[PDB]
């Protein structure tokens, strides 16, 4: 009885192809070659992430500065959910997909510091295979992500961003029901997957300790493109100085 | 700050 296009059908319309990290694979790996090479990668996917969100209906009617906000305090959670969605659809191993010409085995996870980051990244692809989630399930939970976190004192256009926030979670309720399986455990499953989402923070906030303390050690000589060297830079005190409010469905 | 991000979000 819906008379207007799905939400979901947008989302799956704007959602940006897999980019390609350019690794050469002649020479032998590295764990220095490997970081690096997957940051230029990652500072390429923030920028189609800008274009990405863009296209959100109601994002641009925000003010420039929560714009801003929203992707400098989400885009680590944005990306690891990604490539959890990559690494899941696409195997049936214990593997990092960040691109198609840079996966990450379980061989390659034996290289020099690497195992407990891939560990904490694997734990997304755990999630998701565990809970089954499905495409449609996904993407909302992607825009929720974007809307995860805020600073301590709120966005300027706070109730323009609460109704677009409320939007995305009844969406990811219709992409549950719209879902092929239990009708009666739908509730359930609401709870699930916004469990999941909330412990994203989580992820982030070790996957984000390991990358500012490779960000600011001089003696690892890894390259950050600019994209994620300012956003990085501009972080780093707000962590330190609390300024940050995450949005938990399931903790006060 | 965030220069290149804001760069990104104002323009056409
Ligand atoms: C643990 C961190 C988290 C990593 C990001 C996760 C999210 C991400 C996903 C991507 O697909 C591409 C790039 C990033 C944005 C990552 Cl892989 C890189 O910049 C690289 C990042 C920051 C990171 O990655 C690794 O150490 C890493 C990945 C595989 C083995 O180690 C790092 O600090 C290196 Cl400078």
Redesign the interface.
């Known amino acids: 009885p819906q008379l207007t296009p799905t939400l979901v059908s947008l989302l799956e319309v704007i959602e940006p192809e897999v980019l390609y990290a350019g690794y050469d694979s002649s020479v032998p790996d590295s764990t220095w070659r490997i970081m690096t090479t997957l940051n230029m990668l990652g500072g390429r996917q923030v920028?189609a992430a800008?274009?990405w969100a863009?296209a959100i209906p109601g994002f641009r009617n925000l003010h420039?500065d929560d714009?801003?906000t929203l992707?400098?305090y989400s885009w680590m959670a944005l990306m690891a959910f990604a490539l959890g969605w990559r690494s899941y659809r696409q195997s049936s191993a214990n593997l990092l997909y960040f691109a198609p010409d840079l996966i990450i085995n379980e061989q390659r996870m034996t290289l020099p510091c690497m195992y407990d980051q891939c560990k904490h990244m694997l734990y997304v692809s755990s999630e998701l295979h565990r809970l089954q989630v499905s495409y449609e399930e996904y993407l909302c939970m992607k825009v929720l992500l974007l809307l995860s976190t805020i600073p301590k004192d709120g966005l300027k256009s706070q109730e323009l961003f609460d109704e677009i926030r409320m939007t995305y979670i009844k969406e990811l309720g219709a992409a549950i029901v719209a879902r092929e399986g239990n009708s009666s455990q739908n509730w359930q499953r609401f709870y699930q997957l916004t469990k999941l989402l909330d412990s994203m923070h989580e992820v982030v906030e070790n996957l984000l300790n390991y990358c500012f303390q490779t960000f600011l050690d001089k003696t690892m000589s890894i390259e950050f493109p600019?994209?994620l060297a300012?956003?990085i830079?501009?972080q780093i005190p707000k962590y330190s100085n609390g300024n940050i409010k995450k949005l938990l469905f399931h903790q006060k | 700050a965030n220069a290149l991000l804001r760069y990104l979000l104002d323009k056409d």
């Open positions: 920028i800008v274009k863009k420039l714009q801003m992707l400098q600019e994209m300012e956003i830079t501009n």
